[PDB]
């Protein structure tokens, strides 16, 4: 969408999830920077009226800010000139039984935006936990359309942000933990009509392979594999849902995302590579044909759901070839870089040396070399497996600074023990089949259950980490890089922190209400740069806190790993805004006064 491209070029706007089609969470704004960051103060806040994890991050289109809450997925439009006045609100009614099929908290990752024409209003595109993709008139909040795109009776739901490319709204899928076979659809934002829909497993036609799928890298695999790497029909309830983030190349016309883990979690119940799951995927935005596809985790054994963020850049590789690239830090412990035009695998670096499920990732063959001692199988309990199922990286949307060519990654440091069990499939029930125990990895405090995050700056080409700091909890919410030489990220213990992005030095932090699992974002309104982030702990790490569980193996194993998080935060739900000196419209005391005199 060229209009989106152009509005993304303005610092007064943040118009899509991940800010731009590069999905790089970078602002060229310098007004806030290493030299005055100690002057950053609170400007205003807005509570959503909901508890549970609050993921993603608002949108800003000129004078309007749009925020989104946990279930039931309220949308609100706030007036930046008086952010206490709510321009409008959308409050869906959903069946509350949707709650019961959400694996990992009532979260939602955010809104997208379609800039209108003269025939048609601009539209805010949102998902609902109960499966619907809804389009709202972006000035009034009235329903424009609502399509069904997930039935909770067959275990399905929606937690990702959707995405606008051209006059298309693209929507993903949730429920691999309930046997859902991953699907991605594009609907036409003017008509509400389905334009294409494709699957992550089964016959090629249903997956949507392009005739020349993987032609530049045929050792990756080509025809017939979404059925050949299964036994019988086990692909039908096979997982591969895509509930993470998108990116888009306007010139190649390609959207990139990763597909999730295969089902069930019990690897013994599905011999085979389980292809198209765990796959880095490039599809023609408009026909949805799959150009290329790289399976990072063949025959997943760990729930390494392949859905993580994808950051686009242009760099010179190690041989001198100037390349167009994607970079992609995975649950499985491996951060990948591919040429985004052909699939050529360029780098595959451990996110931390403690990773042990693989010895290495052979670049020529593109295979991960498996350490059989850290795999999983029936009648065995695997111990000290790193990463755990929560991954050394989860759904946090990271940033990349194209000036420094550095990626800023919020990492998890969580290992695990793991034993599967046989279970039947019943549509609309859980279809997991394993019992996990999770704890901090080797470089954290394994006895006292602290030390589950890291934050690191990384160059995709030289393969080096310029700096690394351990963090008390997993850095789960992603990060934000700016030209003021600062990177910003929220912590699960409730700080917004700013480190010097050249050195990793910690230079500022502030106690928000609740832990953070959304990424901070930035925009300039009347010559003032503001930094905003969602507060409200939850998501997978919050499940023990949020549902009052104590069984360490509950919440799919996250309960034991995070038993301590609740000593540092409770539930919340709000947007917190910051700026130099707390400058904000209420600096004029009469803004929003009934008396005004």
């Amino acid at each position: 969408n060229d209009k989106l491209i152009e509005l993304s070029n303005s610092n007064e706007n943040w118009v899509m999830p991940g800010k731009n089609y590069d999905s790089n969470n970078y602002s060229t704004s310098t007004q806030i920077n290493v030299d005055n960051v100690k002057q950053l103060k609170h400007a205003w806040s807005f509570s959503t009226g909901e508890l549970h994890g609050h993921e993603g991050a608002p949108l800003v289109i000129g004078d309007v800010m749009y925020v989104h809450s946990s279930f039931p997925n309220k949308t609100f439009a706030l007036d930046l000139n008086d952010p206490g006045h709510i321009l409008w609100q959308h409050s869906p009614k959903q069946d509350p039984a949707a709650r019961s099929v959400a694996c990992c908290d009532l979260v939602n990752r955010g809104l997208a935006y379609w800039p209108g024409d003269d025939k048609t209003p601009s539209l805010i595109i949102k998902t609902q936990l109960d499966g619907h993709l809804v389009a709202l008139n972006a000035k009034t909040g009235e329903e424009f359309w609502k399509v069904e795109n997930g039935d909770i009776k067959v275990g399905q739901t929606l937690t990702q942000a959707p995405y606008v490319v051209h006059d298309l709204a693209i929507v993903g899928s949730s429920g691999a933990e309930l046997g859902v076979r991953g699907h991605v659809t594009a609907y036409n934002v003017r008509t509400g009509e389905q334009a294409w829909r494709y699957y992550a497993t089964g016959p090629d036609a249903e997956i949507g392979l392009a005739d020349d799928f993987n032609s530049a890298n045929p050792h990756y695999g080509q025809k017939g594999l979404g059925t050949a790497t299964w036994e019988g029909d086990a692909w039908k309830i096979g997982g591969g849902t895509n509930w993470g983030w998108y990116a888009y190349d306007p010139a190649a016309n390609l959207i990139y995302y990763g597909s999730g883990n295969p089902a069930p979690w019990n690897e013994t119940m599905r011999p085979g590579d389980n292809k198209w799951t765990m796959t880095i995927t490039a599809r023609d935005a408009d026909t949805g044909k799959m150009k290329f596809g790289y399976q990072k985790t063949p025959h997943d054994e760990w729930d390494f759901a392949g859905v993580n963020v994808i950051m686009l850049s242009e760099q010179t590789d190690k041989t001198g070839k100037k390349r167009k690239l994607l970079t992609h830090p995975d649950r499985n412990g491996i951060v990948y870089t591919l040429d985004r035009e052909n699939g050529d695998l360029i780098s595959a670096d451990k996110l931390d040396d403690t990773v042990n499920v693989f010895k290495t990732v052979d670049l020529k063959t593109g295979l991960p070399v498996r350490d059989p001692e850290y795999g999983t199988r029936m009648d065995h309990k695997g111990t000290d497996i790193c990463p755990s199922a929560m991954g050394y990286h989860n759904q946090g949307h990271d940033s990349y600074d194209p000036q420094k060519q550095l990626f800023f990654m919020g990492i998890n440091h969580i290992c695990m023990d793991w034993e599967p069990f046989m279970l039947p499939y019943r549509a609309g029930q859980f279809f997991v089949g394993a019992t996990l125990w999770m704890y901090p990895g080797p470089k954290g405090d394994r006895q006292n259950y602290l030390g589950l995050g890291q934050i690191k700056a990384y160059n995709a080409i030289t393969n080096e980490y310029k700096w690394q700091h351990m963090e008390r909890f997993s850095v789960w919410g992603g990060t934000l890089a700016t030209a003021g030489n600062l990177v910003f990220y929220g912590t699960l213990d409730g700080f917004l922190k700013a480190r010097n992005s050249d050195t990793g030095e910690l230079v500022w932090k502030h106690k928000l209400p609740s832990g953070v699992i959304g990424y901070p974002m930035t925009y300039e309104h009347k010559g003032v740069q503001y930094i905003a982030v969602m507060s409200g702990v939850g998501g997978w790490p919050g499940v023990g806190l949020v549902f009052d569980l104590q069984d360490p193996t509950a919440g799919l194993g996250a309960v034991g790993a995070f038993k301590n998080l609740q000593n540092y935060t409770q539930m919340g739900g709000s947007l917190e805004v910051f700026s130099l000196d707390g400058k904000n419209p209420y600096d004029d005391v009469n803004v929003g006064e009934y008396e005004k005199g």
Partner: protein, 70 residues
């Protein structure tokens, strides 16, 4: 099973020491029920039909009516 031995490109799965190439017929047999296996394909035919029904009505009157019993 180290993942590097491939009977074909994109297809390196091996069973592990002591486990079979095929699970059907073994103590690991999942015994899935085809009715169940097809549930989602059925569910999606309904969504697509009702969706198609709602866009076509929209096309014609310029107002989206969710509940397709109109």
């Amino acid at each position: 099973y180290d993942g590097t031995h491939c009977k074909a490109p994109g297809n390196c799965w091996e069973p592990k020491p002591g486990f079979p190439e095929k699970i059907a017929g073994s103590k690991y047999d999942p015994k899935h029920d085809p009715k169940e296996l097809n549930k989602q394909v059925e569910s999606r035919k309904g969504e697509e039909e009702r969706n198609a029904n709602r866009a076509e009505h929209f096309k014609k009157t310029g107002k989206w009516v969710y509940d397709v019993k109109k």
